Structure formats: structure tokens, C-alpha cells
């Protein structure tokens, strides 16, 4: 007995086609929350007979309506969603000193924990980002209140205890290097022992971590088999200071390879300032890149070069990195990467720039990749998971204006892109995860 | 006998100051919408003896309100809304082939016109817009009609008749030269003759238009004491297909200077690629510059160093510029112009970027100031016409969430910062022009 049976139209991307509409589909969902059949209405009475259920029993879509599949947010900061959009006119250090440390830092207690990170799953859930890579704090009992906060609201999600024993800025947020190893196995432990369903824990070294660190936490990687989370080249500075801490190794890149945080479960956020050698080095390993655009430009890092790394076959995605991108939303990091491609173009740095169609399976089907889960999300396809938003351009208050000609013709190059360029919240009405609707809240 | 008296916060911008937060202050409004008085709440026993007013006719705004002035936006094309949004993934001309010129070349129809001039009204509107200087179309009727529209609902505007004698790329849309002339004499009469409290005409040459039609054009500016708007030094092509066009002349500052389009009532739309030597006209004619940021992001323009233009004291607002940039909110174009300014930190074109208080200025008194209308809006001086909105971050289905921090202490650095990043439509809850409200809509 399925689910959910869908009739209607099925936006989403395939690894040769950035951009596929499937008008007038049906699509249906097992009980056990996976795309069993997806095909041409045509093809209804089939299906009524090989899936043995009842016309009645199809819920069609509005013409004006139509699926995506979940948002994957390939980074972001859950710790830092209190005072997201705040002042950034600060120098770097100083944003860190007065905002992102004090802040993380009031993660010791439970209730500020609790209350943040409640906030910043629901918003992002209804934002459409079913897949959130999170940074969490170095406390470990908080950052487990995270999971267990985005196991109840449905969110699919890695979550990861922050690490470091280095921090000449803000002394008193750090740990020393033997209680952030001791206290990253029992996180990873305490996670695992809840059996949840689609939230795994995932090895965090933080803005600060000693080579011994470094090379304790690849250990714990290795041994255990875990996803790997962490920041690289993401501004000139922090190039000239990994050279100097880490004089005896040639780059930023291997300073993560060589002490086994480099691996083919990796994800790394910015990638700013990465060269193309170590774009070749990535991709051997198979590590991915989590493309933070928002965050590089609102901070004045730099700026990812993606039609390289496309080029070098790195896996990448995007994700907001809330709070040093302001925005929680996807939907403004797809108009920002896109923003961020047109910026290297105009430099005359590439010859041209990525379709919003490409940024839209980067924002899906790419971050999926990113995260190894494109065996079970990230599009439409059969088997996969039901990780999708239904989107009405036309709901209540909507912040798009729809004329003649948006709904008919070829809808991907007009009220498709309306969506992606002017949609927000208040287009996505239903938000499914593994085939459970997770929004509206109950 | 006032019109309104609040009591509440207000935040606005000066000369002196980007951002001014006058706390708990009292603010009173004329029957003729004129700011009477602006003072801390602590002096209403004087101020209510002084202006013979009873204390429950004062409104207590909400703990979590405060108003701000009307957003101003310098550089719009209304006539382009019905597809913005729509794809820009396809090289200049093709856009202007495929969108641009087929929807304007469509306003030959009332009834279309009438359709999307209300609705872009209405969207600039409750977006908190107070004021618009608006592109229409070559067709007079339909241009009236605009400046009919934005009367009924209350906007203050400009409202511009487009003159193009030229148009290789799409025939269909142009004016014989004589026809630009006769038909532009008629538009500004026909709309002087109405007898509009708010609404001007201004003199619009296009993308298209002879040299013989631009000295026209300054003739009737001149003799008819008119504003003008155009657009120059936008992309690379532009600025190389105006060398070509006019051999004559010195650079595409000049075409305009010596044919009488360039006053100190002169609005030019982008000036990405403004020589300094031409800055200094500008400064010397007290002519304007209109940034718009989403626009030459969008379309791979440039960058429009506006830290360069305000050394040369150049006076500058932002513009929205629909639909070569998507989004109809000037709270976007504030986003954009603060990244524009990181971009160029980044590559180190510039020393330091703008910081949000100072784009804010330039979204409301700078704007005010490149329309020549400083001395009747743009903030909270007294006399002034009241144009603001009232701003509620904790609004029904807010974008934000607030965090106890965020509404006391240096509000300039929280709330207000998060709403600017961050707010929408949503938070806008009522929008004043000239004292009369005008959102929501009767
Ligand atoms: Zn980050
Ligand atoms: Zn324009």
C-alpha cells in the first residue's frame, strides 16, 4: 500500500540535464517513504494495476503547482543562528571576538541550546532545506540536544561537536586536546546510541586545532568510519596562518590528507583560495567542497571558482554558512552562487558563467553528492527517498506576481525561475523527508 | 490639528550620521503630512501645550516597531515587470529579443498596461518604495496611465515615456524621430495638465535614439525646466558601440553634456564603467547616478565603484532597475550594493567597503538627494513630507527570529541589521506617503 500517489508536475535534476520538468506525472511513495514508480499520467491505468491502488486514491497538484526535491544545505553554523543578521562591519576578528565566540560559547547551557537550535531547524525546514550539514558547538551534551532536536522535527542531518585547542582570541571557548578527543568519542559514541534514523554524527575540527589534534581526529575518522566537516582556504589570512602553524607541510590541503581528515567522506566549506593541484588531490581522495557564496562576499573572503572545480571533477555543493552568511535560506545561496559565477566572468577569470539551472541541481542533487547521499536523495528517481517541497508560486501573500504566460510553454524559463529568484517561506507549503511531511508542524 | 502623533522609535539617516536611532521619541504629522515635530517623549507636557493636542490622541507604537523612511528607488522600469524573474540565462541580446522588447512593444494594449502597472505599484509599494523613478514605455497613453496609477494608490514618482528613434535588434519597438519629438511634447503636457500632487514627468531618452533626437530632447528638457533619466557607461559593448555610433564626441559623458542631457536635474542609470575624468562632470552639472546592483551583477555588467563616485561627490542613490535586475525590493538592492562594495574590497580596488548604515543612507537620503527632492523627503528632519513605514521584525509569519539581545543597547548593530538583511514585505506594516497612508490598500 503506497504512502502517496502525486499527480501533477516534478521539477528536479539528473546528472546530464541541470534542469528536467515532468508535466502531468504520477509519482508514488511506499510506505516505507521511497519513490516506487514515477511516469507519464498516460501511463495511470498500468500503474492502477501493477501497484494495485484505486484512482480515488490520487491526490493531483494544482497546474500551477509543482514538486523539487528538499534543498541540501551543505554548511551552516546551527550555534551561530542567534544573532544571524546582525552587524558584519567589523574586521573578522572582532566579528569572531564580539559575536560568533560569545555565542557559542552560551552553548553551556541547555536552554539557550535548546531555544536556538529548535529556532534554526524549523526555519530552515521551512525554507526547504530537508538536508542541513551542521556546526554545532564544542559542547558535546548540547550538540547532541541538536540531533536529537532535528530527529523530532524530521530533518535530515549531520551533526558535528565542534573541535579545538587553539583560540588566542576568545581563551575560554576551547578544550584542551585531550578532552576534545576524549569528548568527540563520547559524542560520536552518545549520537550512534540513539538509533535515530537520519541523523549521523559527523568529525568537526573547528577554527584552531593542533597538528596532534589533527592527526587524533583523523584516527577517529578512520577507525570509525565517519563524515568529515571542516573550513579551507576560505580567506587569504587564514592561508598565511596555516603556513605557519603547519610550516613543514606544503599546503592547506595537506595539512588535512596527511593526517587521514581528507578522505572520500569529506566535506570542506569556502574552497576559496584552493589551487588546481589540490583540486586534483581532492578529487583522488574524493572529498567534496561546500560552496559558501553569501558568507565568502557578506565577509570579504574571495571567491570559489566553481566552473573549476566542475571542472576537476571535485564534488560540490552549496551551503548558507549562517551566521558569516546571514541568510538560513538556499534559495539566496543559489542567487548568490549564481551572483558569484557572473562576478568571475565579468573579471574575464572564466569565459562564462553558471545557468541558474545548474545551481539549481547544485543546491539538490550536488549537495547530495557532497554529502554521500546521492544513492538516496537529491532527485526524483526511483528507489530514492521522498525528499521533496511542493512549491505554489501562487499561495497567499505570495511575493511573486504571476501574468499571462508563466504557466504555460516552457514553464522552466518563467515561473520556474520566478520561484528561485523571488519565492520564499511563504511558496513552500509542504515539506516531505523520507516521505513523512515535516511542514507544515504539527 | 495634527494628522498623527507617534510615539515610538525612529531610525533614519543624516549628512553627518549613516544611521540615527532616536529611541522613544515623539513625532507629529500635519493635516497637510508635514513632519511639525521630532522630539523625545519625555517633552510631551511642552509639545502637547505647544501644538494643543490631548495625550490619547498619541499613538504608542509596539515595543517591537520602529519606523524608517520610504525606501527611494531611482532607476526602475515598470513596464518590464510582468516578466521579471524570468530566465537572464541567454547572451544580452537574446534577452532583449526574447523579453525586453516584446513586453514593453505590448503596451500598445491598455488594458496589459493597466494589468502590470497596478501591479508593480502595488508590489514597490508594500515593499516600503515611497518613491520611484520609473522607465515606461515609447507609448504616450500608456505611460499616462502609469502616472495615473501611481497616483490612485498614492506613490510619489517620476514617470518617464521611453524616446527611441532606434532599433536594429527589434524594428518593431521604435519611433520615427519626428514621432519621439511630438509624442514626447504631448506626454510631458498631458501629464502637467493633471494636476498631480505627486507625480512628474521626466524626460527619458532610451537605448536607440539619434543624435539629431537627443539634442530634441535636451531642448525640451531645458526650455520645459525637466528631469531627465537615461542609462550610460553600463557594459563594455555599450560604452564601445557609443564610440562607433558617435565618433564625434569624446566618451558617452560627452554625447549627453553637449546635447543638454546632463543638468543638475540629470538621473544616469549603472555608470559602471564612468571615467573619473567623467565623474567630475557629473559633479560639475550636479548631475546624478543611479546604482543598481542586482542588475549589473545580474546581467554580467560591471561594478560600479560607488566609494569612487562619493570622492568625487557625485551624488548617488540605488536603484532596483527591473528587470535587468529581478527583484522589485530596495531592500535587496541595499544586499547588493553592500556586496558590489565587497567585491571590490576583495580585489582590492578599493581600501574598504560600504558598511550597511552607509547604504542605507544611500537607499533613502542619498536617493532623495539624486532626485532633487532632499528638501521634501529622505528622513526625519522636520518639515519634510512624511514618507516611512513602519517596520515590525516580530511580525505575523515573520522572516526573522529575534533573540533577547536584539531589541536593546545598540539596536543599529541587531534588529535593525536583521531586518534589513533578512525582512520582507512581511515586516512592512504600514507605508506612509506624504502622511497619507497608503499600506495596506483600502
Ligand atoms: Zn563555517
Ligand atoms: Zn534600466
Given at each position: 500500500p503506497l504512502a502517496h500517489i502525486f499527480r501533477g508536475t516534478f521539477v528536479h535534476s539528473t546528472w546530464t540535464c541541470p534542469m528536467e520538468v515532468l508535466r502531468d506525472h504520477l509519482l508514488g511513495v511506499s510506505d516505507?517513504?521511497?519513490?516506487?514508480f514515477l511516469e507519464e499520467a498516460s501511463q495511470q491505468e498500468k500503474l492502477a494495476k501493477e501497484?494495485?491502488?484505486?484512482?480515488?486514491?490520487i491526490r493531483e497538484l494544482s497546474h500551477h503547482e509543482f514538486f523539487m526535491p528538499g534543498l541540501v544545505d551543505?554548511?551552516?553554523?546551527?550555534?551561530?543562528?542567534?544573532?544571524?543578521?546582525?552587524?558584519?562591519?567589523?574586521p573578522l576578528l572582532e566579528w569572531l571576538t564580539k559575536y560568533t565566540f560569545p555565542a557559542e560559547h552560551r552553548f553551556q547551557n541547555i536552554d539557550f541550546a535548546e531555544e536556538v537550535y529548535t529556532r534554526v531547524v524549523r526555519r530552515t525546514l521551512k525554507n526547504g532545506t530537508t538536508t542541513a550539514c551542521y556546526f554545532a558547538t564544542i559542547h558535546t551534551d548540547s550538540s547532541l540536544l541538536l540531533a536529537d532536536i532535528t530527529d523530532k522535527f524530521g530533518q535530515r542531518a549531520f551533526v558535528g561537536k565542534v573541535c579545538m585547542?587553539?583560540?588566542?582570541?576568545?581563551?575560554?571557548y576551547k578544550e584542551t586536546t585531550e578532552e576534545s578527543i576524549k569528548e568527540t568519542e563520547r559524542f560520536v559514541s552518545e549520537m550512534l546510541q540513539k538509533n535515530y534514523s537520519r541523523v549521523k554524527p559527523i568529525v568537526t575540527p573547528g577554527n584552531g586545532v593542533s597538528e596532534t589534534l589533527m592527526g587524533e581526529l583523523g584516527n577517529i575518522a578512520k577507525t570509525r568510519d565517519l563524515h568529515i566537516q571542516s573550513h579551507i582556504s576560505e580567506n587569504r589570512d587564514e592561508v598565511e596562518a596555516v603556513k605557519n602553524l603547519?610550516?613543514?607541510?606544503?599546503?592547506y590541503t595537506s595539512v588535512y590528507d596527511k593526517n587521514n581528515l581528507?578522505?572520500?567522506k569529506t566535506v570542506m566549506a569556502h574552497?576559496?583560495?584552493?589551487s588546481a593541484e589540490e583540486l586534483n588531490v581532492f578529487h583522488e581522495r574524493g572529498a567534496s567542497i561546500a560552496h559558501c557564496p553569501n558568507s565568502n562576499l557578506s565577509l570579504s573572503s574571495g571567491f570559489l571558482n566553481v566552473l573549476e572545480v566542475l571542472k576537476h571533477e571535485v564534488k560540490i555543493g552549496l551551503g548558507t554558512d549562517v551566521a558569516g552568511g546571514y541568510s538560513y535560506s538556499m534559495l539566496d545561496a543559489i542567487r548568490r552562487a549564481v551572483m558569484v559565477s557572473n562576478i568571475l566572468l565579468i573579471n574575464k577569470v572564466n569565459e562564462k558563467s553558471l545557468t541558474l539551472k545548474e545551481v539549481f541541481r547544485l543546491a539538490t542533487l550536488g549537495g547530495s553528492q557532497a554529502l554521500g547521499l546521492d544513492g538516496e536523495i537529491?532527485?526524483?528517481?526511483?528507489?530514492?527517498?521522498?525528499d521533496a517541497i511542493l512549491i505554489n508560486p501562487?499561495?497567499?501573500?505570495?511575493?511573486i506576481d504571476l501574468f499571462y504566460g508563466?504557466?504555460?510553454?516552457?514553464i522552466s524559463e518563467a515561473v520556474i525561475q520566478k520561484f528561485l529568484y523571488l519565492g520564499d517561506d511563504?511558496?513552500?507549503?509542504e515539506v516531505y523527508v523520507g516521505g513523512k511531511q515535516v511542514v507544515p508542524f504539527s
Open positions: 516505507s517513504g521511497k519513490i516506487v501497484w494495485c491502488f484505486k484512482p480515488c486514491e551543505t554548511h551552516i553554523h546551527a550555534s551561530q543562528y542567534s544573532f544571524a543578521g546582525s552587524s558584519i562591519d567589523l585547542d587553539l583560540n588566542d582570541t576568545f581563551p575560554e603547519y610550516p613543514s607541510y606544503k599546503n581528507l578522505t572520500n574552497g576559496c583560495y584552493l537529491g532527485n526524483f528517481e526511483v528507489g530514492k527517498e521522498f501562487k499561495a497567499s501573500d505570495s511575493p508563466d504557466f504555460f510553454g516552457d511563504r511558496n513552500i507549503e
